[PDB]
Every structure is written in structure tokens, then in C-alpha cells.
């Protein structure tokens, strides 16, 4: 991948342990990132710091792109390493020079913006159409259809903490706890184990 | 406008769409890029029961139908419907990609708008997640008060909007919108006069 490697030679590259914060919402946006290895969560918060994950981003993903096309913008979200990460960074100013040399690097970036918009639009859809019970139910169902969902004699089973579920739908761990109990008692799932079984 | 947009537009056909006509249908094969020369549109998606949600309004100078551009074989991710009479330039993706090669600035213009839509749709996903239906409505009326067609008034801004529209934006029924709008004007936050609302 000649264009990528060229792009990266113009970056500086650093390692970040899991749980460390790469981007703080509200900071001035002046640099672009690219994930060389690992995974990050893109997070927003309510006024009391309850979190919602807008996306996971993985190796090959650009981050910090949204301040690129107009000066004076702030980071729109927190971005937090979910595993140990290797992350390339480059100033918007140097990136813009790179685009002049070869606009393919802009194509790649824009393709990812367009995917993100489709996915975030779909999520806003579910947030409008579903209450917190439906959100959690549709999350568990989505997760059971993932390539990594394990077969179970009674349906599919998943590994996912209550806090992670809470991050997906933007509710507390305890709210998740209560609604999982309700869904168990409605005979839709079982969560009495260290994992979750979605029936059917 | 500038010589670059005019260059781009001379490679487009201009089509007219009457108010309430659909420009783009969800699920259609995406092979075409659009640009709004005049007028305004609504972007909509739907739940399995035919409930509609307004993801966004877009206006003169806005690109539409861009999300299929970066990868072949995609579907339209939403319906796009004329809110007023519209004049809309259109061009095939393939021909757009050729233009990008002559002058990458036209891709820059487009990517700028994608970045803005991702910021706006993320903030909206947060609203839907974190706010109760009343907070969604009170935030929506501010956002509406800075659409191109929301003009001034002694005690703040003034807008025209239906209950159905608001309900489509925040995710609730007209009836519920009616009850909340009533609450909001007791809380001396607005005054309503038919379909026209003054936002303080
Ligand atoms: N809805 C989203 N989906 C995926 N990534 C996002 C989303 N919102 C923000 N981001 C990423 O989080 C970053 C926060 O900083 P920026 O606003 O500079 O750029 C942002 C994007 O790279
Ligand atoms: N969240 C959004 N904000 C603004 N416009 C959007 C949004 N989602 C979809 N659209 C527009 O609606 C169009 C539907 O067709 P496309 O998916 O080709 O391209 C889409 C975008 O131009
Ligand atoms: N709970 C909901 N979540 C998302 N959208 C809704 C919900 N309830 C109603 N809507 C949509 O918003 C519209 C507002 O006007 P109507 O009540 O005619 O029809 C409504 C539905 O299409």
C-alpha cells in the first residue's frame, strides 16, 4: 500500500496503553490521527458524564478528521483507547500539503467519513424509535448476530459487560442491570452466567 | 458562488422538484451525486412500522447523494424530499470522480460538508440518548431558529413548523408534541401562534 506508507512516513507515531484518552472533547482540533494498531472508542457524554459510545474504530481508521476542513474547530468527542494502540498523528497543515501531492489520501479519508455518517444516522434512528428497553433488547439481538457470537444450545451467547451495554445505549450500568433482569424474567435471555444467552 | 462551483455545475444537468416531491428513495442504487442550486430538502429514514424520522434539513449549496460515492454498489441510505420548490444539479459518480482528478478542491468542498453532517448527527444521537422528549423538543426549537428560513423577531427568533415535523425530529407523536409545546410556553420559553413559534 504505497499511498499509506507514504502518508505514514509524514506522521509521528506513538503507543498508547488501553484506557488512555487520545482526544478530549472541546480541545482545539489541529491534527489528524490514523490507527496503525489497536482499537479506540469514540465517546460522548451527558451533562453529568454518563457515556455513550458513537463508534469503535480500529486499525486503518482515521481519527480527528472533523476539524480538518474549517479552522478554529473543537474536537466533537472523546476518543479512548480500548486496547493498547499504535497511533499516527500529523498536523492538518501537513496533511493539506499531502492532499495537494496525491488526493487519493483524501478519497480514503472521505470514504470513511461517509461510512461513519451512514452508521451514526442508523443509530440516531434506533435512539428515536426505541426506548431504553427496546435499545437494550435490539443491542443484545445485534450482538448475537455478530461473527464472534458463540453458538449455544438454546440460541446464541455473547460476552459483554453491563457497562459496555450501557455505553452502547447511553444508560447506566444499573439501568442495564435492572432491564437485563426484566428480560430474563420475560424468558428472552439468560444472564445468570458470566455471559449472556440470547434465545432463538 | 465561485469559478470552481460553476465549473462543477457546468458538468451537471439541472432538474426541478416541486415541493414534497422525492429526489432520492432509500434503497435505490446510488450512482448519482446531487447539489442543491435552489431550495431546501428533508432527509428521512423509517422504522419497520413506517414511522418517519427527520435526520436533517439541507439547503442551497448543500451536496446530496454523496454517501455512495466512495464505494460502488451501495444503496441510498435515506429518503430525500423537497421541502420547498428545488433546483437540483446532478452528475454521475463516475463523472464526478473524473472531475476530482482535474481539480481535487471539489472533493474538499464535499468532504467539508460530510464532516459537518457527522458533527451534527452525532450531537443529535447524544440528544436522543440523553434527553427526555421535552429536552429534545427544546433543543430542536433552538436549532430550527438558525435554519436559513428562520428570521428575526423582537423577543428572539421566529419559525414555522408543524407538530408532525417536530415529532419526526425528536421521535414522538403529534399529540405528545402538542402537550409539550403547551408546557414549554407555560415555562415562558416560547410562544406559539398556530404553526408559527417564537423561540426566546
Ligand atoms: N459519529 C461518529 N462516528 C465515528 N467517529 C466519530 C463520530 N463522531 C466523532 N468521531 C471521531 O471522534 C473524533 C473527535 O475529534 P474530531 O471532532 O476532530 O474528529 C472525531 C472523529 O474522528
Ligand atoms: N445524517 C445525515 N445528515 C445529512 N444528510 C444525510 C444524512 N444521512 C443521509 N443524508 C443524505 O441523504 C442521502 C441519501 O442518499 P445517499 O445515502 O446516497 O446520501 C445521503 C446523504 O446525502
Ligand atoms: N416513539 C417514536 N419514535 C420515533 N418516531 C416516532 C415515535 N412516535 C412517533 N414518531 C414519528 O414522528 C411522527 C410525528 O407525527 P405523527 O404522530 O403523525 O407520526 C409520527 C411518527 O412517524
Numbering used by the authors:
A (entry chain B): 9 to 208
B (entry chain A): 8 to 207
Article, verbatim:
We examined amino acids predicted to show altered (V132, H160) or neutral (V140) responses to altered amino acid side chain interactions. The removal (V132A) or addition (V132L) of a side chain methyl group of V132 was engineered to decrease and increase, respectively, the strength of hydrophobic interaction across the dimer interface. Computation predicted that these mutations would result in more negative and positive cooperativity in CAP, respectively and that the most important contacts contributing to this effect were with L62 and V132 of the opposing monomer. High-resolution X-ray crystal structures of CAP mutants V132A and V132L demonstrated that these variants possessed decreased and increased hydrophobic interactions across the dimer interface, respectively. Comparison of variant crystal structures with wild-type demonstrated that there was no statistically significant change in structure. Cooperativity for cAMP binding was studied by isothermal titration calorimetry (ITC) for wild-type, V132A, and V132L proteins to examine whether the experimentally observed changes in cooperativity matched computational predictions.
